[PDB]
Amino acid sequence: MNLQEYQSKKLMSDNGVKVQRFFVADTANEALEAAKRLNAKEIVLKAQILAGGRGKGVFSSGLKGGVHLTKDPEVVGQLAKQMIGYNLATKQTPKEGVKVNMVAEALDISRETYLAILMDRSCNGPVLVGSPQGGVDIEEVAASNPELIFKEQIDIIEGIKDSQAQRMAENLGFLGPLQNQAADQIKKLYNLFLKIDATQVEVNPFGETPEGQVVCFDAKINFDDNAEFRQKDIFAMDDKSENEPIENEAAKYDLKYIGLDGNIACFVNGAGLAMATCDIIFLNGGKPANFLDLGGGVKESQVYQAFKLLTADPKVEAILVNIFGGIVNCAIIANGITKACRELELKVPLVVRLEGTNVHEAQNILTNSGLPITSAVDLEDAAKKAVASV
């Protein structure tokens, strides 16, 4: 999962991590009056999108720049109007960008360092990923000079040792008294990183102010989806516009829905097997509109909503079913497909490939149903059939 900066920063505030004071605003006028409420010399305005590289980004409004600052509040609204509702595009967004929908006391920067905590397989647990030369150009600096990137593995049992926090702080260039304040902020970040079940906490820049303050100027937190049952309050904060409503309503019945731009709607019981079906469809000339994953669990209800959902948007002149390894006899879902197809009355072709327990008594269920349901034997067969529907 991913939360917006302003949400990640409030979490940082409640856990001893120091950040700029800010106010949120939905409209461009509230951003102007809220910038007036802040009462601060220089103020920084940021677009909130589940994506980085905002600084060097462009805008559908042509505003050019996802982050800016100025000492004139009236310029906040002047610059806020020009992005609230527009698509902010960065080198991390899919070209089209993300529809934008924070004003904080800007602080002066005298040194930028990159800091990130994360779970990494190669390091077999938590890692402190840092660089003294942070900022937007971190990845370039990371590529041109790898030795500028310092890694410190943390023992999940012992946790963050003072000797490790001090070394990282020193490698990031925090000299003198800053070395202790930074190291402490590193220890306070790591502790938060564990508290919230985050797979990543990225602070870029991990900043040093002229007044000797170590501040986190940006907060990108990735939360472990598998930990939602223990992070109720945090997963309650995921905004009600996650990608698209087509995706959320699917997840209501735990159905993983990935959208695309195509005409065939896939329906597979396995992420890997779903991506495979999309591949082989591509090989045969089709182009999938999306795919709806089932994982392992299966219930007559899900197949009902599954079909009701895939036929939602009008860009699906056919759907492909490929269930290879359902925990229940697909002879049972075969009757869940017919039931979920005749009562829903869908006007798009329907290709089914099933393979499992008693597939013989299951395949004839579709053939003798009188419904537009064509059967397939193998994965290659299922693809060519779905493609053949134009």
Binding site: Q92, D197, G272, I280, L283
Partner: protein, 302 residues
């Protein structure tokens, strides 16, 4: 070292399996599948159920209780995600030679903690979590994979995917090559067994003459497996290896950070990397069986 426990990956006629979460709905179902398939399931565990029989087999409170009394040598875990990590630790404490955690959804932090001690011991080998399990066609089936598609044969299957693993299995049985040992390592980042472990077993198993590796975009799993084959499956008696990587047609992922990019530096790179190690990458997932078959004929092995 932990690698010393790789050997326990090769289940067989003799391994005596038990089931953690035995009374659970998934535990019961897949437990029956195992009994009907012939797997030597000798019982399971469920706190508060010790002393009661289930599927005609004994239920125990803890794993040691279930181990000493049955002499079990493998465990399969269906405990829900919140308590699955502990289920593993209970088996390691009981020094169960092989632990197969099927459960999907274990927090990464839990497994980082489990795996931390796992690497500090060599008694217990862990497969998964979030994997389909391991199956020795004919002799032993630990997991959820449908047994009616396997057939003891000459090809070793290692898969990071899930249900996609069954395509390679169903295709190798159809071509007549069958499977020597199929292992699913699961899709979680922190697991007990990886590609390089199963390839080591496969490269040293006589019954394993061909290899199929199944992966997908993301991570460096496939490349690490590739560099292994490049340094241990080259030269004289090199066993043919086939692979399919799902997701070549997947779209961008939409980032929110530089961290992943910095620690990296999926897609074509995984493909051409496997090719560097002499691996035959099947572009379509449907012709995995038809490919390994021909690589066998290329060097007259049928």
């Amino acid at each position: 070292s932990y690698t010393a426990s790789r050997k326990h990956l090769y289940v067989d006629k003799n391994t005596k399996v038990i089931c953690q979460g035995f009374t659970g709905k998934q535990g019961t179902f897949h437990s029956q599948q195992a009994l009907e398939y012939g797997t030597n399931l000798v019982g399971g565990t469920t706190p508060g159920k010790g002393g009661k029989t289930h599927l005609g087999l004994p239920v125990f409170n803890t794993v040691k209780e279930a181990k000493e009394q049955t002499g079990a040598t493998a465990s399969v875990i269906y405990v829900p995600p919140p308590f699955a990590a502990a289920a593993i630790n209970e088996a390691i404490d009981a020094e169960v030679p092989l632990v197969v955690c099927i459960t999907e959804g274990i927090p990464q932090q839990d497994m980082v903690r489990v795996k931390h001690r796992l690497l500090r011991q060599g008694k217990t080998r862990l497969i998964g979590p979030n994997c389909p399990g391991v199956i020795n066609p004919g002799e032993c089936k630990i997991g959820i994979m449908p047994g009616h598609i396997h057939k003891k044969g000459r090809i070793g299957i290692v898969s990071r995917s899930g249900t996609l693993t069954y395509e390679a299995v169903h295709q190798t049985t159809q071509v007549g090559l069958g499977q020597s040992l199929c292992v699913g390592i699961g899709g979680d980042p922190f697991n007990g067994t990886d590609f390089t472990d199963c390839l080591e077993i496969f490269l040293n198993d006589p019954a394993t003459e061909g290899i199929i590796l199944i992966g997908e975009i993301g991570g460096n799993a496939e490349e690490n497996a590739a560099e292994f084959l490049k340094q241990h499956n080259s030269g004289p008696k090199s066993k043919p290896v086939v692979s399919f990587i799902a997701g070549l047609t997947a779209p961008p992922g939409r980032r929110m950070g530089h961290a992943g990019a910095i620690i990296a530096g999926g897609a074509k790179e995984k493909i051409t990397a496997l090719q560097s190690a002499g691996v035959v990458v099947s572009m379509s997932p449907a012709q995995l069986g038809t490919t390994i078959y021909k690589e066998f004929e290329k060097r007259k092995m049928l």
